[PDB]
Structures are given as structure tokens and as C-alpha cells.
From a paper:
Here, we answer these questions and reveal how the nascent 60S moves from chromatin to the late-assembly compartment in the nucleolus of [name] ([name]). This partitioning provides directionality for the nascent 60S to move into the nucleophosmin-rich GC, where its biogenesis continues.
To understand the molecular basis of the defects in 60S biogenesis caused by the absence of Fkbp39, we tagged endogenous [name] and analyzed whole-cell lysates or isolated ([name] pull-down) nascent 60S fractions from wild-type and fkbp39Δ cells. We analyzed the isolated [name]-containing nascent 60S by cryo-EM, which revealed 3 major states in both wild-type and fkbp39Δ cells—each state can be further classified into multiple substates. The accumulation of state 1 particles in fkbp39Δ cells indicates that Fkbp39 is required for a step in 60S biogenesis along the transition from state 1 to state 2.
Residue numbers in the entry:
A (entry chain t): 51 to 249
B (entry chain o): 102 to 238
C (entry chain K): 5 to 29, 41 to 266
The structure:
Amino acid sequence: FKRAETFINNYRQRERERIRLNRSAKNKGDIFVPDETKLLFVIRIAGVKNMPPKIRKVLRLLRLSRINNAVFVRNNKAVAQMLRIVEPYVMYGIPNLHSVRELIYKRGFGKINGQRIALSDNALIEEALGKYDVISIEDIIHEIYNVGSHFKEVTKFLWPFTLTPVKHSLMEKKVKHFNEGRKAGYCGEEINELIKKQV
Amino acid sequence: KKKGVLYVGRLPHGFYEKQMRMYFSQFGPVLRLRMSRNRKTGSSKHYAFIEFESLDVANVVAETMHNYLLYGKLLQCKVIPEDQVHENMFKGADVPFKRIPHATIARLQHEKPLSKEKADKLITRHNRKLKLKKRKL
Amino acid sequence: ELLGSDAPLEKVCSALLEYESKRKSNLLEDEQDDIEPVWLQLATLKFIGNNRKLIPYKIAIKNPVIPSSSEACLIVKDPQRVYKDLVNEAGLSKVVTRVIGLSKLKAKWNSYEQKRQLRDQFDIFLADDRVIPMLPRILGKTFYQKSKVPVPVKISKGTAEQLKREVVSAYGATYFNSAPCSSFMIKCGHVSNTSTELAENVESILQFVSKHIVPDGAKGIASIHLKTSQSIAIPLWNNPNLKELIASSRK
RNA sequence: ACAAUCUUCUCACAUGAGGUGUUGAACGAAAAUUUAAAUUUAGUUUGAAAUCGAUUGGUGAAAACGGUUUUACCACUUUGU
């Protein structure tokens, strides 16, 4: 059963998003575009019922169609505009070498035949991306970090990560609405710490 | 059997038509739902009417949601007997409201493509319009 | 002269004052010097406003329209002790009766009844320039529809003399709230003003209107009238070129 | 999950431009306007108050088969980058 306050609470959140979207898009066509880095790491923190269709579509374009999904994206104007549109639901920052290597080595899954298959062996990577001079996980890591020529192909091959918050502590297991304290918006270098908790 | 009409008043802002039907359909099917809105802007008038397939269901909803402390407001739910329930009282139920931007239409009506004949039909006898004020002097 | 190469002022406003005086017709105890205000009407050839800009236009005027006895509530960004001390330091206590921080305004006045009570307690609501955008909320239609629109007093640096200068400028200036429409009404003063003073107010307002309200100024102006809350809209001046201006614009 | 992003200042050179955000109902004056209903609008009343009174112009976004139904601030920069 659902009580009337939840229906009102959803509406107020929807109108809160509508006001934010109009303000961000109209008369605020400016985005700061985090610099000195060609790579960004984005994770879907939150989500709301009856999400505005514009937010719903932008999330699937960023491949963040499910909560706790993480995606490597190229730092450019187009991504930044969409990232500003979906700001309250995503946490993004600059992933360093240790995070990129650990994420690929531990939570990297490839879309082989269109299914989620673990990148356990370089044979599948060579078969799936041999035409782009990609033969190994380290080739994937080098392409992702440096934003190489085949960055577009590598990201499409890579399945979005699933960085669900970890509840190891007894207090974490008990408290309500636990999400590791995941804030929203741009964090910069702190996402490496968030990655380190998950990997 | 008998269709019961239920008036809900003091609706908290955000407890609109979609929210009412989603909530009140839990008690049972909802036939027609209309929440009053202003003509000019379409903003909520903070009260509404609902039709339930059986008057007994409307009685149960009235007895459970009357004086409901919701967002600082007590929700006023009372069943209207059918003899003052009017047939037109549900006119426009379940149909989204159209917020006509009369300021915007009047703006375009002010500044729209125009021709010489319409300009002549605009100026008319503005001198007479001045003359009427002069007689008032 | 800026209107149509002529200034049919003076005589028009003197006549309006004579009309206002001549149509005069228990005892009450709570009396005030309130007099009928002077309303200048102005019709344009296009909608000067895209949307209601809930921030008044500080049209500086030499004959103040706000009576000097009016109490002011100053709305400032928190902290609130700082500007309370500054008002006391600058001797505005008889003028700036109350200073309210923004968060305290958001918390202590949430009911419409509380909003109405606060609204009626004061005659003018001065507000810090960097908290005006917040004020459309927290005040709602109780303020912004019932003729109580906060005024943007600029006190960013916050020192005694600037506060005094901004306040006296605030009382000395009339305010107009731009809304989408072709015709708008602006306050020039009250009947207590002399014919020359009101005419000085009219010309200063028209100079401000032509620059900052009507993008094409007098060419955008259609007609001008003088009026009070009840009287005839006495035509101060009408466009001599509107016959060709309407044809050119509407094509 | 009655919790959430309504801005605690900008840009340019002391100066200019910008900030898009308002509960509903009732009373009421006389004014400019626009193409009979529509825009501004004095001044008031009010527990976030309520018992039919809905106005109806335009823009397109998805399902569906060129119609069709679904948006509950889609408004003229007009509903899903």
C-alpha cells in the first residue's frame, strides 16, 4: 500500500526537477567542463519515481539506465551538457590510473555476443576488438586512460560497472537508506576514494 | 451499485489529479475525478470531487481520510448526497487542463504580421477617441 | 520634447490638480496624511515585457513618492546582527525599523497569515540586492500581488554611509514592476505635490522609461495620460508619427 | 522517504545589462490598450480558508495503427540529448 504523502512527495520532487531543468537549460547555457583531463568517471547515485522523460532519456544515452551503474566518458562539451542536465543523480570525477586499472581488472565486463561476459581472458578481447589493435585488458586500460583512437569502440564493448554500496559494518547494515554517503554532483578527485571503497 | 461522489478539500499542494487517482484507486476503482482549477491560470483550487462505483466505498474513504493531517493540512473528505450532486459537476473530469498563455497570445496579437487594410482598420477614428475624452473635459 | 518634439506638460498637470481638488464631494481616529496618488499612464506599440520581472525599477525622482515617515523593513543576507548594528550606527532606527535576515524570514514567516501580518506591519520593504531573487518565494502573492514588492537596496560592502545613501535614494525613487503588457501605470506622486513638482516627476519618469523600459523610446510610445486612482486619464501627449510607425512595425 | 537543487549574486567598463521565481477565494474603483474576451491595473478582506460553474488557442514527445490515447505548469526558445 502507498500513503498520500509519498504521492505528494513525488510530485514536489518532480516539480523541483522541472524548475531545475528550466533554470539549467534556459538562460544558463553555460557549463564549466572540468579541464586538465580528457577522461571522466560517472556513477548513477540516485533515482526518482516518475522521472522526467528528458532525464530518463539522457540517462540511457549515458548508459546509466540503472542505479549504481558506472561509465567512462570522454571529457567534452556534449557530455558535460548532458551531465549538467542529469546532475542530481550522478557523481563524477577524475579517475586515476590505479582506479582505472583496478576497475577493469576487478569489475570489468565485456559485451560479447551482446551478453555480459567477464573479461577473464584476453582471447575474447582479441576476438571482439582485434581489428582495432586491442588484444588484452591492458590494451583496454591504455585506450581508456589515454582516450585513444578506439576509445569509442572500447567503451561500447565495456559493460557499465555495478558499484553497489558495500555494507560491511554493523552500523552500515542497520541504518536506513544507506548509500555510503554518496553525494551528488562533481567531486573531482574524491571519486578515486569512492572507487577505492568498491574495488 | 449506487455511484458515490466524494468531496476532498484542503488538498496539500502536489496532491493533484494523478496523485488522487493513484491513491484513491487503492480503496477501489475510481470512475471520474476532477479537481477544481482557476480559469485564467489553471492552478489548483485545493478541492476536488471523486466518483466511486459503490456509495459504500465512498463511505469508507470518507471515514478514513477525513481530518487527515497531511502536510500541515487536515484533509476534508465528505460524501455529497446525490440530490445536490449535479450531472455537470464532473464536466471535464480526467482531462488534463490547458494553461492558455493569454499574455503570450495577446503579445503575438500585439505583434503579428499586418497589412495596410488592417492598419487602417486599427487607426479607425482615433481622433474621435480623443474627442470623446475632450467632451468629458 | 523627447516625446514628440514637444512637451505638452505643465498646463495638463495643473488642470489635473484643479480637477482633483475640485471634485471633493462619523469622524474616525486613526488618521493619516494619505492623499490620492498621481498615476501616469503610458501606452506602447509593443509589449515592453517578456515576463513579469519581480524586481522594481529604481526610477530616481526628485520629489519622493514614499512619505518620509514610512517605516522600513530591511531584508538582508544572514548574519542579521551585523546590519542591525550598522542601522543603529547610522541612525536609521526611525527609518529602518526592523532588519530581518533571509533565513529568519524563511523560517519565522511561513504561514500566509504570518506573511500578511509582517506585510501590514511595514510600509516599505527594502531588500539586499543579493537576496532579491529568493523573495518571490518566502513572500508569494501576499507581497508581490498585494502592492508590497521588495526594493533592491545595494548594501554589499555594508558601511554606515552607503546604507544612509542607499536608503535615502530608496525613499527618493519611485518603483515600477515590469509586466507583459502594452500599457502600464507608473506613480508620479501625490496631490500634495505642486503642479511643477509633479511635472518634474513626469519628465524624469519619461526619461527613464524611454531608455530602460521602451527599447525604441518615444518612437515606441503610443500615448500618455495623467490620472489618479479615480479621475479621467487626461491625455498628456499623443504620438504624431504613430500613423506610419504602426504600419512600419506591423509588417 | 510528509527528506531532496528557488539561486546568501553575476558580467562589462562609480556606471550599464542580467536574476524568472508569486496559495485559492471574495470585494471593488476607473483607466489605457489590443484582436464581444484578452492584456496591464488602484485599493481592500482571509486559518494553506475551499462543495458545479472547465477556460479552451497553439506546439510535439512517446506507444499504436495517416487517424488513435498518454502527459496534470508543454507555452511561442512551446511535452523524450
